[PDB]
Design an enzyme around this catalytic site. Structure first.
Site, short mmCIF file in Angstrom:
data_model
loop_
_atom_site.label_atom_id
_atom_site.label_comp_id
_atom_site.label_asym_id
_atom_site.label_seq_id
_atom_site.Cartn_x
_atom_site.Cartn_y
_atom_site.Cartn_z
N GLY E 30 0.80 -1.20 0.00
CA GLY E 30 0.00 0.00 0.00
C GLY E 30 0.84 1.26 0.00
CB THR E 31 -0.03 4.76 0.26
OG1 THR E 31 -0.55 4.56 -1.06
CG2 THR E 31 0.68 6.10 0.31
CB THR E 32 4.84 4.95 3.13
OG1 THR E 32 5.50 3.90 2.42
CG2 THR E 32 5.54 5.17 4.46
CD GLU E 47 3.58 9.53 -0.46
OE1 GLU E 47 4.09 8.84 0.45
OE2 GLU E 47 4.20 9.83 -1.51
CB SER E 75 -2.00 1.29 4.81
OG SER E 75 -1.13 1.16 3.70
#
Lengths: 245, 233, 243, 242, 245, 243, 102, 250, 198
Positions: E30-32, E47, E75
Site C-alpha cells: 500500500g501507501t506509506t 500520502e 493502508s
C-alpha cells in the site's frame, strides 16, 4: 473446505438410485434377524440379540422389538439408538390420534407418516436418514391382523411372513413353501425356531439370544390382549414346542 | 490450482487481494465504453453503448436520480437494476429526510462496504460493476469513480472501457483548459466527442447507440438521444 | 477426504489433528511465565521481552484483571489471547448478579472449558489453542490454580508455568514440595515470596532483566493489583542483597 | 439451515438431477393407460414376484383425488405420496374457494408446480417419480391423459405408458390403436391393455392389476379370472398359419 | 492442499496461518503512512500516490477521524479499511448514548480487537487484509495503538506501513534519544514529512502529494485541526531542504 | 462441484454462460413486430405420432394487448406467469391502465432475475438463472408495437425481429434482410412459416407449430387449427408462385 | 392520550374548469383561539400539472403529498418519464392510505 | 448467521458402519479403566484417575459425579467430554419427570432420553460426536438397582458386572469367574480392587482411584430431621483415607 | 338465534332446522339451510350466530373426506364428535372465541345403530335421542321424551316433531319460515323438503 468435502449423498447419485439406499441394506444385514409371522390367532414376532454374554442381564428384554399400542407392536432392524428416536415419536403421533378421534388407530396412518421423516432428510435439510428398517404389526376391525414392513428408502410392503437381517432371501425361502393359510400360535412358532437356527453361526438355538414377543386374541376375555414374554417363559416355549436346541 | 485463491470468497491471494476482483476489473472492458468528466459547475457524461445485432438496441445503463446528479456505469449490469435503484432510493431518501444533496463521497462510502459484505459473509457473489457517479452541490461538480474493488476517489474526468486508455491520457494536457472554460456546455460536450473518436480503434461514431448526459446549476439532468445529439455528431 | 486440514473429523490415531497443532503450537510466541501459590496469597510472574524503544511497557501484559480477586495468566498468540479475556470478563459480572456471589475458580474454569469443548462439536467455528490459566485467592477455601487446556480439560494445579522450561522449574519445585508435603507456600510476607519465585526462574533462564522486562503481579486477599515500574525494580535489587 | 442449492447445473444444458430422475422411472414398474369415450383405463404391474399380501391390505399405485379422478403413478411410495396428499389438499383448496371440482389440466400444474420449485429453488432436491394424471371434468365424459415429467413438463396423449421398456410397448399401440377412432365398449380398452401388459411382467396373474376409472364415481378393479379370458384369445389366431 | 490457503478455522504450527500471512504483503504493498506520539499530542501522516494528472489533490483523505477526539487511518485495501471505520463511528454514538461521555483511546481499541478476531474464528467469515492505525486525545494523555491485520495490537510510539518499517525505525528511534518524551510535537510534523520523504527515494515514480491530520494534548485539548495554508508548504519544503537534488 | 461465486475469465457467471444450451434445446420460435400487429409463433414438432397438441400451451398471454411465448424448460416459464401477470394486474391495481412494454420488461426483469447462493431477505435459492427463452411483445400507448425478449442473462434489448431456438443461428442471419419497415401483417404471416420450414426437420403441420398475433383492438388472439391450416395452404400456394 | 385530531382548520375549494383546473386554499394557520401562522400555503405541486392540496392535520399530508411527489417519479423511473394517467393518478393514494388504514 | 454448515457426519462406509463410531472407541481404549457391579446389596462404581503432571491435584478432578441422588455415573474417555454432558443432561433431566410429577425417571428410561441426545450429536448437521463411553448405574423403584453401559451411539446395555477402558478384555473375564445370586456390599469392593488396581500400573495411591457406592444412606446427608418419606441420597463416595483402608484388607 | 330441532328414532335419526336469513330488522330469504352433506351415513346440522356459522363451508369435512378418499371408509359419528368439539374447544382460549351450536347426527354401520349428538359453544358432547339449542329447547323438552318411545317408527316421528312446531308457531315470537327434513338410515341420507305441504 465446506463445499469441496460435501458430496451431497442425499441428491441423485449416478447409480440410478441413491447412495444411502444400497449401503443402508448392509447395516441391515449386520442387524439381528427379525422374522414377523401373522397367524390366525395372532402375530408372531421373533428377533435376535447382539453379543449375548454370561453376565448379560435380561429383564425388559426389548431391544429390536417394541410395542407401541396395546394392540399394535413394532419391530426394528438396525442400530438401536437410531430406532429409539422414532419409537416414542410414533407414540406421540399416536396419542395425538387419541386426542383426535378417541379410538384405536390403524397401522397404515403411521406407516406413511414415519416414512417421510427419514425421506425428508434426503429431500431437504441436507441431513442423513436412518438405515433402520421398520416392521409394523397390529390389529384392525376390518382386515383383522395387520403385519407391515418398511425400508430405509421410504417405501412399505405388507407381508404375512417377513424376514430381515442376515440371510434375508434364505429365510424367506423356507417359510414360503412351508406357509399355510391356517396357522395357530404353536404352528407359527415351530416354523420360526427352525428358521432362526440357520440364520446365525451359533449352535442350534438358545433362549438367551431369542427375543420373542407376540400377540393373541384375548386372555380371560375374547379380545384385546398382548404381553411380552419374559426370558424365563421363553425357555418353557422350547419344551412346549418339542424342540430343545 | 487457480480457484483456491479465486473461487473462494474468504481466501487471501498471495498478494493480499482477491482474484474475484481481477475478473471484475476485466468485466469493464467486456462492456460498453463510457466517457465522463466535469468542469466546475457543469459535468458531461458521454457514454457509447453497443448492441449484439444491427436490429438490436442497447439497454440504458444510466439511471436518472435527481436533477442535480447523475450516474453512468460500465461493464455489465446484473444487479444495477436493483443496487443502483436502491441507491436512487437513497437519493430520494436523502432529499425527503436529510434534505441534503447527497454528495458523492457519502454515496460511495456505503457502496464500498456493500460489495465487501458479499466477500465477508459467505453465501453470496460480489458485484463487479464499475460505477461513475457525478453530483452537484454548493462546492461544484464532484465525480465518483467506483471500482469493483471499492475505490472511492474524485477526478475531473476519466475514461474506462475497451481500448479507452488512449483517450484517457491524451486529455490530460488539456484538462486545465476545460475546467477554466465555463458558460458554454456545448463545447464541454464536444470535448467528450473527441474522446470517443480517440477511444474507438475499430468502428466509427454511431447515432442512436450514443448516449450523452449533462448536469449543471440551472440545467437539470437529462439524457441526449436521437435528434438531441445531431449537433454533437 | 480424510484430512483434517479443513474439516475436523476423528483421526485413526485417536487424536484430532487440530488438537495436535493446538498442542504443537504453544510457545511459538517464545515467552515464559510461572504461577505459584502462597499461604493467604498468590504470586505470579511472567517473562517479558521488549527489543524496541517505541513500545509502551505499560501496555503489553499477559496478566489481565477479571474480577477484584481474580487474576489470569495467558500464553499464546496476542489476537487470540484477548478473545478468552473479554468473554471471561463479561461472564464474571453475570455470575455475580445471577447466583449472588462473585466468580470463584471452580466456575470460570468450567464455563470457559465447556465453551471450548462446544467448539469440538462445531466444525465451522475455530476453537482456541491458547494456553489459559485462571488464578485467584478464595476468602473461604484459599488459593487455587486451574490451567485450561485447549481440549477443555482442567484440573487442580498447585503450581504451573509455560514454555519448554515448565518441566525444568517443576523439578526444583517438586523436591521442595515433597519434603514439606504442602502444595502451596506456607511462608508469609509475599514481598519475599516474589523473590523466591524469581530464584527458580533464573535457574531456567540464567540472565537478569530490568523493571520493564518482567511482568510480575501478586494476588492478595480480596484484592488484585499489578506491580508498577518502581515496585518491580525494588524487588530485583533487594534479592541481590540476600544472595 | 441449508442456504445453498442442491441442484447441479450442468454446462451441456441437461441437468444431472433431471437426467437421473428418469432412471428412477426406468427402474420402477410400468403403469399402462389408455383413454376412451366415456371412461379411461389405467393398468399397472408389480416388481415383487412372490406375493404374500393382498391388494386390500397393501395399497401401491392406488390413489384418488376427486370423486371422478383417480391418479396412478410409477416410482417410489415415498416421494410420490407426498404429491398425492398435497394434490388432495389442493383439490379441496379449489373446493374451499371455487366450490367446484378442479379440472385435470389445472390439477396437473399443481403436481408440476411443486416440482417446479425443486428445479428452481435450492435447499431441496427434485423427485424421481413421474405421474400419469387421468380424471374427469365436471359434466364432461371425455377423459384426459397427461404425462408428468419430474422437470414439470406435461403433454396431452392418447395411449401413453411409463416404466420398464415402456417406449417399446407403446409402439404396439401406435399402429393397431388409433386416437381418431377410439373404442366404444369399456371392455375393448381392456383387450388392448392386457396384450400390452404381457410384454414386461410376462407370466403370472398376481402382479397384473387393472384399474378402470368410470364416471358417476365408479372404480372397477378387474380380477385375475377376467384377465385370463383375453389371454386365450391371443393364441387363437396368432398360432394359426394362413 | 495445505489447508492454510483456504480455511482459517484450523491451527498453524507457527501460530499464524498462511492465509493471515498473505494479508501482511498487502499491507506493505500500500501507501506509506506513519504516526507520531509525543508530549504535545499525536500527529498522523497520509500520502496519496498520483498515477495521472486526472487525480485531484486535497480530496481523498485516508485518515478517518472519529468525532474530534479520535483519529484513524488505514493502508492498502480501501474497502477493508473503511469497513472498520463504520464500525467505530456507529459505536461512537452508541457509547455517548449509554454513558453520555467521550470514549477514551483504550476503550476504542478493544472494540477493534474483538471485531477482527471474530472474523478469524469462522471459516465462512472473511477477515481483513489491512492494518489499522488509530489514535487521538483522551482524558488521560497521548496514546497511539495500531491494529495489525492478524488482530494483535499493543502500545506503539510510532506506526509504519507501505515501505518497510525498518526504514522508518531509523528516524523514530533517533527522536527518542534527542527528546525523551518527544517534547515539542510541532517540529515532528516537519519530521513526519522527512520520514515520508525517506521512502520517496526508492519509491519515486510520479508526482507525490502529502496530507497531515493531527491532534494535540495542549493546543487542541481534544479538538481537531488540519494542516493548510502556510503550514502545508512549510513542512513540504523542510523535507526538500536537506536534499535539494 | 463448487459454489456460484467462481467467475469466468471474462467476469461472468458459469450458469449464465452455459445457459445458452437449454435455449437451443427448446422449441424454435421467431417473433416479428410489424407496422400492423405483432407476429408470434413457436414450433411444437412431435415427440411421437400419438402426441396431441391440443392441451399443450407453449404460448401464454400476460394481458390482452400484449403476448408471451416460451422456448426451453417450462419451470422458469410458468414462474413468470405468477409474476408478470401479477405485476400487470398490480399496475391496473394502482395506475389502472396499460403498462408500457418498455417499462413492463424492466419491471419483470427485476423479478425475472433473482438468484445467488443464499440471502435472508431476497430468495436466491434459484440455481440456473434461466433455462427458457421468453418472448415479450405488445403495443405501447405512446410509441407503438415493441418486440422484446427475456435473455438467459436476465438483461433485455430492443429487437426489431427476434429469432430463438436451435436454428436461430441460420434464421437470424438472413433475418436482417427479411425484416423491413414496410412489412405488413399479412406479408409477415407467410414469411415466418417459410423460415420455420427450413429449421423444422419434419413436414409443416398444424400440430407441429403454433402461431398467434397481437392486435391493438381485439387483443391477443391465438390461431385455431382450422385457421392455422389456412396459413399452411397459403404458404404452399405462394412458394409455387415465386418461380 | 394519542389524539389524531387537532386540525389547524382552513378551507380549500377544488374547482374543475373547462380546459383548466383551479385549486385554492387559505394560508391561515390557527390552533384553538390563537393563530399560529398567517401565511402558510398548503397548496403544493406534484408535477405533470398535478396540484394536490389537503385540509387536515399538517404532518399527514406533508409526509404524504411530498412523498407522493416522489411516488409520481417512481412511475417515471421504469417508464422512461411516461405521462401518468390523470384519472387514476389518485387511485394509488387509496392503496398507500391502506397501509395507514389501521 | 452462525451455524452455516448443515451437512451431516461421515456417510456410510464400505464396512457397513459409521467411521466416526469406530474411532470413538479408540479414546476409550486409550482412556481410564472403569467398571461396575450389582450385588443387590450395593453398587460399586470404581475408576482410575490418570495424572499427567506431579503438580496436579486429584481433589478437583472428579470422574464420578452425582446427576441425581439415586443415580451414579462414570465415564471412560476424554475428561472434558463428560463435563458438558453434566451441564446438559441435568438440565434435560430437570425438564424430565422430575418437573412433571415428583421425581426424576428411573435409570432405564432416563439414560434413554440422555443417550438420545448423544445420538442426535451423531446425526444433526454441524455437530460432531464424542469419544467417551459412560457407565451409568442407579436405583429403580420396582427393579431395585440398575447398571447400564452406554456407547457413543447410546444403546442401553443392561449388564450385571462389566468393565471398560484400557485392557477391558482382560478385566472383563475376571468379573465372570466369581459370581452368584447375591453378593455382599463389602465383597464387591474387594473384587473391584483386585481387578481395577492390578490391571493397571504406576498409581498405587487411593487419590487416583475414585470409588463410590450406591445403596448406603447416612442420616447426615438428608439435612432435615423431619418425617423420612424417602430413604435419601443412596450415592456415597469413599474419602482419601477410606479407600486405603480397603486396600489393607487385601 | 335460530330454532333447530332433531330426533333419533330406533332405526334412524331425523333432523329439522329452521330456514331463514334474518339480521334484526328483516327476513331476506325464506329458505336457509345451515348444514353440510357428509358421507351418506353421516349428517351434521348447524346452529348459532349466522355470521360464523355460514363461514364453515368446508373445514372439518375436508379432513373427513381426506380419510374417506384415502381409505374409502366412513368413520363413526362418535369419533367425529370428539374432533369438531376438540377444535372448537381450543378456540375459546384463542384470540377469537367462537360461538356455535352443532348437532352431529349420522348412522354407524359397524354397530348398526343411529347416533345423534348435541354440542353447544361450550364444548359439551352428549348422546341424546333429541336435541335443541337456545330458545328451541324450552318449548320442546317437555313434549319430547314425554310422548317418546324407543319403538317409535318414522311415521310416528314426523308428526311428533310437527306437534312441537305448533308450539313454535304460537308461543315463539320468531317464525322459522319453513324447515327441512333429512333422515339418515342404513340406506343413506334421504332429503325431504316437504313440511308445510306434507
Amino acid at each position: 473446505g465446506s463445499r469441496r468435502y460435501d458430496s451431497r449423498t442425499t441428491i441423485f447419485s449416478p447409480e440410478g438410485r441413491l447412495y444411502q439406499v444400497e449401503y443402508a441394506l448392509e447395516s441391515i444385514s449386520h442387524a439381528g434377524t427379525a422374522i414377523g409371522i401373522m397367524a390366525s390367532d395372532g402375530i408372531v414376532l421373533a428377533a435376535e440379540r447382539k453379543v449375548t454374554s454370561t453376565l448379560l442381564e435380561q429383564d425388559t428384554s426389548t431391544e429390536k422389538l417394541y410395542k407401541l399400542n396395546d394392540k399394535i407392536a413394532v419391530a426394528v432392524a438396525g442400530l438401536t439408538a437410531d430406532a429409539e428416536i422414532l419409537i416414542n415419536t410414533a407414540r406421540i403421533h399416536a396419542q395425538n390420534y387419541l386426542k383426535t378421534y378417541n379410538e384405536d388407530i390403524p397401522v397404515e396412518i403411521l406407516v406413511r407418516r414415519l416414512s417421510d421423516i427419514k425421506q425428508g432428510y434426503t429431500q431437504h435439510g441436507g441431513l442423513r436418514p436412518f438405515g433402520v428398517s421398520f416392521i409394523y404389526a397390529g390389529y384392525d376391525d376390518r382386515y383383522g391382523y395387520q403385519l407391515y414392513t418398511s425400508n430405509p428408502s421410504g417405501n412399505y410392503t405388507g407381508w404375512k411372513a417377513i424376514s430381515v437381517g442376515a440371510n434375508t432371501s434364505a429365510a424367506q425361502t423356507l417359510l414360503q413353501m412351508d406357509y399355510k393359510d391356517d396357522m395357530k400360535v404353536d404352528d407359527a412358532i415351530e416354523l420360526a425356531l427352525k428358521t432362526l437356527s440357520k440364520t446365525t453361526d451359533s449352535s442350534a438355538l438358545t433362549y438367551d439370544r431369542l427375543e420373542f414377543a407376540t400377540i393373541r386374541k384375548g386372555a380371560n376375555d375374547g379380545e384385546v390382549y398382548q404381553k411380552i414374554f419374559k426370558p424365563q417363559e421363553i425357555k418353557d416355549i422350547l419344551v412346549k414346542t418339542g424342540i430343545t436346541k | 490450482f487457480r480457484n483456491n485463491y479465486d473461487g473462494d470468497t474468504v481466501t487471501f491471494s498471495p498478494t493480499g487481494r482477491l482474484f474475484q476482483v481481477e475478473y471484475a476489473l476485466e468485466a469493464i472492458k467486456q462492456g460498453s465504453v463510457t466517457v465522463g468528466l466535469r468542469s466546475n459547475t457543469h459535468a458531461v457524461l458521454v457514454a457509447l453503448k453497443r448492441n449484439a445485432d444491427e436490429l438490436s438496441s442497447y439497454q440504458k445503463k444510466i439511471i436518472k436520480c435527481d436533477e442535480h446528479m447523475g450516474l453512468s456505469l460500465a461493464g455489465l449490469a446484473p444487479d444495477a437494476r436493483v443496487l443502483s435503484n436502491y441507491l436512487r432510493q437513497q437519493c430520494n431518501y436523502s432529499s425527503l429526510v436529510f434534505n441534503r444533496k447527497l454528495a458523492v463521497e457519502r454515496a460511495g462510502h456505503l457502496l464500498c462496504d456493500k460489495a465487501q459484505k458479499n466477500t465477508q459473509s459467505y453465501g453470496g457473489r460480489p458485484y463487479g460493476v464499475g460505477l461513475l457517479i457525478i453530483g452537484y452541490d454548493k462546492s461544484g461538480a464532484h465525480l465518483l469513480e467506483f471500482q469493483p474493488s471499492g475505490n472511492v476517489t474524485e477526478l475531473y474526468g476519466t475514461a474506462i472501457g475497451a481500448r479507452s486508455q488512449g483517450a484517457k491520457t491524451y486529455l490530460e494536457r488539456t484538462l486545465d483548459t476545460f475546467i477554466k472554460i465555463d458558460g458554454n456546455p456545448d463545447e464541454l460536450i464536444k470535448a467528450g466527442v473527441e474522446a470517443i473518436s480517440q477511444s474507438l480503434r475499430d468502428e466509427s461514431l454511431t447515432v442512436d447507440n450514443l448516449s450523452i448526459a449533462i448536469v449543471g446549476k440551472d440545467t437539470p439532468f437529462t439524457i441526449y438521444d436521437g435528434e438531441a445529439v445531431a449537433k454533437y455528431i | 477426504a480424510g484430512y483434517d486440514r479443513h474439516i475436523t473429523i476423528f483421526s485413526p490415531e485417536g487424536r484430532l489433528y487440530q488438537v495436535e497443532y493446538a498442542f504443537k503450537a504453544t510457545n511459538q510466541t517464545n515467552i515464559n511465565s510461572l504461577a505459584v501459590r502462597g499461604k493467604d496469597c498468590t504470586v505470579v510472574i511472567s517473562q517479558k521481552k521488549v527489543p524496541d524503544k517505541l513500545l509502551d511497557p505499560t501496555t503489553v501484559s499477559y496478566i489481565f484483571c477479571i474480577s477484584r480477586t481474580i487474576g489470569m495468566v495467558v500464553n499464546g498468540p496476542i489476537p487470540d489471547a484477548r478473545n478468552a479475556a473479554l468473554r471471561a470478563k463479561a461472564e464474571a459480572a453475570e455470575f455475580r448478579y445471577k447466583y449472588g456471589y462473585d466468580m470463584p475458580c471452580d466456575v470460570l474454569a468450567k464455563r470457559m472449558a465447556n465453551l471450548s469443548q462446544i467448539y469440538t462439536q462445531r466444525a465451522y467455528m475455530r476453537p482456541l489453542g491458547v494456553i489459559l490459566t485462571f488464578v485467584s485467592v478464595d476468602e473461604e477455601l484459599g488459593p487455587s490454580i486451574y490451567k485450561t487446556d485447549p481440549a477443555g480439560y482442567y484440573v487442580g494445579y498447585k503450581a504451573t508455568a509455560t514454555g519448554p522450561k515448565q518441566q525444568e522449574i517443576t523439578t526444583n519445585l517438586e523436591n521442595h514440595f515433597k519434603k514439606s508435603k504442602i502444595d502451596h507456600i506456607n511462608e508469609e510476607s509475599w514481598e519475599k515470596v516474589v523473590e523466591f519465585a524469581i530464584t527458580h526462574m533464573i535457574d531456567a533462564l540464567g540472565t537478569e532483566f530490568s523493571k520493564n522486562d518482567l511482568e510480575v503481579g501478586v494476588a492478595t486477599k480480596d484484592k488484585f493489583f499489578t506491580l508498577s515500574a518502581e515496585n518491580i525494580e525494588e524487588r530485583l535489587v533487594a534479592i541481590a542483597e540476600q544472595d | 439451515g441449508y442456504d445453498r442449492a442442491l441442484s447441479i447445473f450442468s454446462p451441456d444444458g441437461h441437468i444431472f438431477q433431471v437426467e437421473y430422475a428418469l432412471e428412477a422411472v426406468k427402474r420402477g414398474t410400468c403403469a399402462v393407460g389408455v383413454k376412451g369415450k366415456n371412461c379411461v383405463v389405467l393398468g399397472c404391474e408389480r416388481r415383487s414376484t412372490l406375493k404374500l399380501q393382498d391388494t386390500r391390505i397393501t395399497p401401491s399405485k392406488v390413489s384418488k383425488i376427486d370423486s371422478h379422478v383417480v391418479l396412478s403413478f410409477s416410482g417410489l411410495n415415498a416421494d410420490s405420496r407426498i404429491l398425492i396428499e398435497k394434490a388432495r389438499v389442493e383439490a379441496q383448496s379449489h373446493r374451499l374457494t371455487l366450490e367446484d371440482p378442479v379440472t385435470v389440466e389445472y390439477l396437473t400444474r399443481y403436481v408440476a408446480g411443486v416440482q417446479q420449485r425443486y428445479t428452481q429453488s435450492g435447499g431441496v432436491r427434485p423427485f424421481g417419480v413421474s405421474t400419469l394424471i387421468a380424471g374427469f371434468d365436471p359434466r364432461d365424459d371425455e377423459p384426459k391423459l397427461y404425462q408428468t415429467e419430474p422437470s414439470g413438463i406435461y403433454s396431452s396423449w392418447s395411449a401413453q405408458t411409463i416404466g420398464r421398456n415402456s417406449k417399446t410397448v407403446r409402439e404396439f399401440l401406435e399402429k393397431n390403436y388409433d386416437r381418431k377412432e377410439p373404442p366404444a365398449t369399456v371392455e375393448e380398452c381392456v383387450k388392448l391393455t392386457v396384450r400390452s401388459l404381457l410384454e414386461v411382467v410376462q407370466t403370472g396373474a398376481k402382479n397384473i392389476e387393472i384399474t378402470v376409472v368410470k364416471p358417476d364415481s365408479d372404480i372397477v378393479a378387474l380380477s385375475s379370472e377376467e384377465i385370463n379370458q383375453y389371454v386365450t384369445q391371443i393364441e387363437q389366431e396368432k398360432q394359426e398359419q394362413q | 492442499g495445505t489447508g492454510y490457503d483456504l480455511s482459517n478455522s484450523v491451527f498453524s504450527p507457527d501460530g499464524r496461518n498462511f492465509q493471515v500471512e498473505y494479508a501482511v504483503k498487502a499491507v506493505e504493498n500500500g501507501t506509506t503512512s506513519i504516526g507520531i506520539k509525543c508530549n504535545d499530542g499525536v500527529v498522523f501522516a497520509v500520502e496519496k500516490l498520483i498515477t495521472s494528472k486526472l487525480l485531484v489533490p486535497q480530496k481523498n483523505v485516508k485518515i478517518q477521524v472519529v468525532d474530534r477526539h479520535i483519529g484513524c487511518v488505514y493502508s492498502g485495501l480501501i474497502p477493508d479499511g473503511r469497513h472498520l471505520v463504520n464500525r467505530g463511528r456507529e459505536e461512537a454514538a452508541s457509547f455517548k448514548k449509554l454513558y453520555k461521555t467521550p470514549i477514551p483511546i483504550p476503550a476504542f481499541a478493544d472494540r477493534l480487537g474483538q471485531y477482527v478476531q471474530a472474523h478469524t474464528l469462522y471459516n465462512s467469515v472473511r477477515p481483513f487484509g489491512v492494518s489499522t492505525i488509530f489514535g487521538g486525545v483522551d482524558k488521560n494523555g497521548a496514546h497511539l495503538y495500531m491494529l495489525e491485520p492478524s488482530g494483535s495490537y499493543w502500545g506503539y510510539k510510532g506506526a509504519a506501513t507501505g515501505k518497510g518499517r525498518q526504514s522508518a525505525k531509523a528516524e523514530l528511534e533517533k527522536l527518542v534519544d534527542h527528546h525523551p518524551e518527544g517534547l515539542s510535537a510541532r517540529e515532528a510534523v516537519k519530521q513526519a514529512a522527512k520520514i515520508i520523504y525517506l521512502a520517496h527515494e526508492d519509491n519515486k515514480e510520479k508526482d507525490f502529494e502529502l496530507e497531515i491530520s493531527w491532534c494535540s494534548l495542549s493546543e487542541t485539548n481534544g479538538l481537531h485541526k488540519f494542516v493548510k495554508g502556510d503550514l502545508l508548504q512549510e513542512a513540504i519544503d523542510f523535507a526538500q531542504k536537506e536534499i535539494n537534488g | 462441484d463448487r459454489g456460484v461465486s467462481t467467475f469466468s475469465p471474462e467476469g461472468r457467471l458459469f450458469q449464465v454462460e452455459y445457459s445458452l444450451e437449454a435455449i437451443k434445446l427448446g422449441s424454435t420460435a421467431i417473433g416479428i413486430a410489424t407496422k400492423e400487429g405483432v407476429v408470434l409463433g413457436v414450433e411444437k414438432r412431435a415427440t411421437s405420432p400419438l402426441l396431441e397438441s391440443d392441451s399443450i400451451e407453449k404460448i401464454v398471454e400476460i394481458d390482452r394487448h400484449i403476448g408471451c411465448a416460451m422456448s426451453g424448460l417450462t419451470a422458469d416459464a410458468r414462474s413468470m406467469i405468477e409474476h408478470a401477470r401479477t405485476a400487470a394486474v398490480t399496475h391496473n391495481l394502482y395506475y389502472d391502465e396499460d403498462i408500457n412494454v418498455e417499462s413492463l420488461t424492466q419491471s419483470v426483469c427485476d423479478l425475472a432475475l433473482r438468484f445467488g447462493e443464499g440471502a435472508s431477505g431476497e430468495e436466491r435459492l434459484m440455481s440456473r438463472p434461466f433455462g427458457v427463452a421468453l418472448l415479450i411483445a405488445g403495443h405501447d400507448a405512446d410509441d407503438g408495437y415493441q418486440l422484446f425478449h427475456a435473455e438467459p442473462s436476465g438483461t433485455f434489448y430492443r429487437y426489431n425481429a427476434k429469432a430463438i431456438g436451435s436454428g436461430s443461428e441460420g434464421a437470424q442471419a438472413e433475418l436482417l434482410n427479411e425484416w423491413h419497415s414496410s412489412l405488413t401483417l399479412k406479408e409477415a404471416e407467410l414469411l415466418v412459416l417459410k423460415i420455420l420450414k427450413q429449421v423444422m426437420e419434419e413436414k409443416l403441420d398444424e400440430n407441429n407449430a403454433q402461431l398467434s398475433c397481437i392486435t391493438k383492438q381485439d387483443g391477443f388472439k391465438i390461431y385455431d387449427n382450422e385457421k392455422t391450416a389456412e396459413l399452411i395452404k397459403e404458404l404452399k400456394e405462394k412458394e409455387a408462385a415465386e418461380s | 392520550q394519542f389524539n389524531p385530531y387537532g386540525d389547524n382548520g382552513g378551507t380549500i375549494l377544488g374547482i374543475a374548469g373547462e380546459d383548466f383546473a383551479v385549486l385554492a386554499g387559505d394560508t391561515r394557520n390557527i390552533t384553538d383561539y390563537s393563530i399560529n401562522s398567517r401565511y402558510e400555503p398548503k397548496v403544493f405541486d406534484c408535477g405533470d400539472n398535478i396540484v394536490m392540496s389537503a385540509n387536515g392535520f399538517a404532518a399527514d399530508g406533508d409526509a404524504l403529498v411530498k412523498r407522493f411527489k416522489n411516488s409520481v417519479k417512481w412511475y417515471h423511473f421504469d417508464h422512461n418519464d411516461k405521462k401518468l394517467s390523470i384519472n387514476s393518478a389518485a387511485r394509488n393514494i387509496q392503496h398507500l392510505l391502506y397501509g395507514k388504514r389501521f | 448467521m452462525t451455524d452455516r454448515y448443515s451437512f451431516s457426519l461421515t456417510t456410510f462406509s464400505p464396512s457397513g458402519k459409521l467411521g466416526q463410531i469406530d474411532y470413538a472407541l479408540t479414546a476409550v481404549k486409550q482412556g481410564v479403566t472403569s467398571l461396575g457391579i450389582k450385588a443387590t446389596n450395593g453398587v460399586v462404581i470404581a475408576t482410575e484417575k490418570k495424572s499427567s503432571s506431579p503438580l496436579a491435584m486429584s481433589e478437583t478432578l472428579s470422574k464420578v459425579s452425582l446427576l441425581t441422588p439415586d443415580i451414579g455415573a462414570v465415564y471412560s474417555g476424554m475428561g472434558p467430554d463428560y463435563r458438558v454432558l453434566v451441564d446438559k443432561s441435568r438440565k434435560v433431566a430437570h425438564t424430565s419427570y422430575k418437573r412433571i410429577y415428583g421425581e426424576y425417571p428411573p435409570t432405564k428410561l432416563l439414560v434413554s432420553e440422555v443417550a438420545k441426545i448423544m445420538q442426535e450429536a451423531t446425526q444433526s448437521g454441524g455437530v460432531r460426536p464424542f469419544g467417551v463411553s459412560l457407565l451409568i448405574a442407579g436405583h429403580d423403584e420396582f427393579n431395585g438397582f440398575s447398571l447400564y453401559q452406554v456407547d457413543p451411539s447410546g444403546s442401553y446395555f443392561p449388564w450385571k458386572a462389566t468393565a471398560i477402558g484400557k485392557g477391558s478384555v482382560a478385566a472383563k473375564t475376571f468379573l465372570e469367574k466369581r459370581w452368584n445370586d447375591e453378593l455382599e456390599l463389602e465383597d464387591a469392593i474387594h473384587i473391584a480392587l483386585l481387578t481395577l488396581k492390578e490391571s493397571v500400573e504406576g498409581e498405587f495411591n487411593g487419590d487416583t482411584i475414585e470409588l463410590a457406592i450406591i445403596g448406603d444412606e447416612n442420616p447426615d446427608l438428608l439435612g432435615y430431621t423431619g418425617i423420612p418419606t424417602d430413604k435419601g441420597p443412596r450415592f456415597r463416595k469413599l474419602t482419601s483415607q477410606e479407600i486405603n483402608d480397603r486396600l489393607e484388607a487385601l | 338465534m335460530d330454532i333447530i330441532l332433531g330426533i333419533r328414532v330406533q332405526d334412524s335419526v331425523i333432523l329439522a332446522s329452521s330456514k331463514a336469513v334474518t339480521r334484526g330488522i328483516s327476513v331476506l330469504k325464506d329458505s336457509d339451510d345451515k348444514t353440510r352433506q357428509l358421507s351418506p351415513h353421516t349428517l351434521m346440522s348447524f346452529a348459532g350466530e349466522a355470521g360464523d356459522t355460514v363461514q364453515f363451508a368446508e373445514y372439518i369435512q375436508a379432513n373427513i373426506q381426506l380419510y374417506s378418499i384415502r381409505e374409502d371408509y366412513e368413520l363413526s359419528p362418535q369419533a367425529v364428535s370428539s374432533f369438531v368439539r376438540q377444535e372448537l374447544a381450543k378456540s375459546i382460549r384463542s384470540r377469537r372465541p367462537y360461538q356455535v351450536n352443532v348437532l352431529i347426527g349420522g348412522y354407524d354401520k359397524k354397530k348398526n345403530k343411529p347416533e345423534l349428538y348435541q354440542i353447544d359453544y361450550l364444548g359439551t358432547k352428549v348422546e341424546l335421542p333429541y336435541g335443541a339449542h337456545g330458545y328451541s329447547g324450552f318449548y320442546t323438552f317437555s313434549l319430547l321424551d314425554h310422548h317418546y318411545r324407543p319403538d317409535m317408527t318414522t311415521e310416528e316421528g314426523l308428526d311428533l316433531l310437527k306437534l312441537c312446531v305448533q308450539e313454535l308457531e304460537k308461543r315463539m315470537p320468531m317464525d322459522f319460515k319453513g324447515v327441512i327434513v333429512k333422515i339418515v338410515d342404513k340406506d343413506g341420507i334421504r332429503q325431504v323438503d316437504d313440511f308445510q305441504a306434507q
